[PDB]
Design a binder for this molecule. Structure first.
Ligand SMILES: O=C(O)c1ccc2c3c(ccc(C(=O)O)c13)C(=O)NC2=O
Ligand SMILES: O=C(O)c1ccc2c3c(ccc(C(=O)O)c13)C(=O)NC2=O
Ligand SMILES: [Zn+2]
Ligand SMILES: [Zn+2]
Lengths: 340, 322
């Protein structure tokens, strides 16, 4: 049944915009770099987090905080407090703690006064992880502020990134030498000054260099279907999320959940021969089945923070998971009509 | 036979089972000079037989450089610039390796047993080499080189080319700098298979590294044997390493390097090296139009001598390995 899938992959392919986004983010950086607190700001990598939203872009603004002290908040292995006029963030302390609210409030207010200078009509949507702009009433851009630390990764990541049997232990050591990032994200009436660990840069490298063989998808003999499986998994969720848009059931589910499950499947199937392009229908069925397992199990560990469960009941209602399960199982049983 | 090569590699590792942070003190006192403030390590032993001799590259970044090729020696270049800490060393618009080495050879003795690769410290021994670092894009002579696309992938080829390249003081004309990629060579060797997990599990154990070790040991032993003769004087472990890289391009798949076939793979490396001698062609792996085996560089009689000696060794189960 791969014919209906690659039909979807061809239709999704013809979304082949950025430039009006580039000019806005470039103008935003030029002004943001004039502030002492945001002097070292810069782009991380335009990224299409949603596969079926060509008018939705996503950028990450990085800003290094040299020599910080991360204090874990109440054993939530992903949320941390940030500790440290030698610090240019001196206007944002709430004691010894970097205030995420104040740091975000100024970041938001600078962009507000900066989208008005532009020729091009830009609107900031109303109000964490941070600001969304509306370029010319058609294209929306989500900007996320990310603290950068070039220090070694927190101890909660020690057992994560289990890519040794797939991308090798040597690659795993190399990626862990790269910096990590912290995004302002409240934690569960919420601790409003916490930051969540972020490895979006590592996730990019893993996706765009994804085979056991270094030449995977570089010749016809080693062409795998890893990327297509993730694309279809994202399209499925987006279609269902939009189909049941005003039932609120699928609100808390996002492409990161689907992307996390896909990484775990990559660990369980480390050989390129398990992802042969002629097996797209089977491979996709196994990806859908595994995601369904995480739903029924209420266990989807963060790929980098294994003790952080993305599908715990404290984060996502069991009813919402049961609803996602029923919808996905109906689709898979009936050859995915939501793709049409 | 094949058991003789495994025995040699076995003795080579006992030879290295049992090193000096002296160099860390050198860069302490060397970084305090104005012209050498951007100094540091780059990463080794060329002589695999005697591990009592080390080799270091002292990297020094040279920001605004424009390279001009010297009479189409696609490896050698004059370094000019486009406040300047090395203003002491200019001989006009070009940068003098003579005065830089002299000042570099002045503080090695000042802040010190030096020996006038620029210097040699006797502790053990370490060959210190001065290298200019350039973060610019590689010269046009490297365009058709690093042919690793069918082996380590085109993607990897693009990542390594973004890394800086280096220039060492090398005679050709006496103020020329030769291209150096000892850092890329290091990565290519310590990350050598088509599979990223090559040599990380018994199922994917290749013999690439051992074929290079035996090739280096074969040349070093023959060079010692005929030391009183001058035939093998200009052959070096870098020639052996370069030939091994081209053999890797020729045999990209890991299945062509199964450690069960050490004898077959090693004979492949010998055969190709032999072919480079008879035809007098051994291109630099990064600079293809630079032939390390040209008749201008090495005597044909010298090549034919090494050819006949290695041919004797291969025909008698390599008694050089006893
Ligand atoms: O789509 C999102 O909101 C989202 C984006 C990125 C990330 C996450 C994470 C957890 C939950 C969500 C979410 O709330 O869905 C999410 C996470 O642990 N690491 C991320 O990098
Ligand atoms: O062993 C050496 O002398 C040596 C070391 C390193 C290099 C070279 C090169 C050419 C010739 C020799 C040599 O003359 O043998 C050599 C070269 O093109 N690139 C090198 O990186
Ligand atoms: Zn692939
Ligand atoms: Zn190997």
């Amino acid at each position: 049944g791969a014919s209906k899938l690659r039909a979807v992959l061809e239709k999704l392919k013809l979304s082949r915009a950025a430039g009006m986004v580039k000019g806005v983010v470039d103008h935003l950086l030029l002004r943001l770099k004039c502030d002492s607190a945001f002097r070292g700001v810069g782009l991380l990598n335009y990224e299409h987090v949603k596969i079926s939203a060509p008018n939705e872009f996503d950028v990450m603004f990085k800003l290094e905080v040299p020599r910080i002290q991360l204090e874990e908040y109440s054993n939530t292995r992903a949320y941390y407090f940030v500790k440290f006029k030698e610090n240019p963030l001196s206007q944002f302390l709430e004691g010894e703690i970097l205030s995420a609210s104040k740091m975000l409030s100024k970041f938001r207010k600078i962009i507000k006064e900066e989208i008005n200078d532009i020729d091009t009509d830009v609107i900031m949507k109303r109000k964490g992880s941070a600001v969304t702009l509306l370029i010319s009433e058609k294209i929306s851009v989500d900007i996320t502020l990310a603290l950068e630390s070039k220090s070694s990764w927190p101890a909660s990541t020690q057992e994560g990134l289990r890519i040794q049997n797939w991308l090798s232990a040597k690659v795993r050591k190399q990626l862990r030498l790269k910096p990590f990032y912290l995004v302002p994200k409240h934690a569960k009436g919420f601790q409003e000054e916490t930051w969540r660990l972020s490895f979006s840069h590592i996730e990019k490298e893993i996706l765009n260099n994804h085979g056991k063989s270094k030449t995977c998808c570089e010749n016809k003999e080693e062409k795998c279907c890893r990327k297509d499986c993730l694309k279809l998994m994202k399209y499925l969720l987006e279609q269902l999320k939009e189909r049941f848009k005003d039932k609120k059931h699928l609100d808390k589910f996002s492409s990161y959940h689907v992307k996390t499950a896909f990484f775990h499947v990559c660990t369980q199937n480390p050989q390129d021969s398990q992802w042969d392009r002629k097996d797209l229908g089977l491979c996709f069925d196994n990806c859908v089945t595994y995601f369904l397992q995480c739903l029924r199990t209420e266990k989807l560990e963060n790929y980098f923070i294994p003790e952080f469960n993305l599908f715990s009941s404290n984060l996502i209602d069991k009813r919402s998971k049961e609803f996602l399960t029923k919808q996905i199982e109906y689709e898979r049983n009936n050859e995915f009509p939501v793709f049409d």
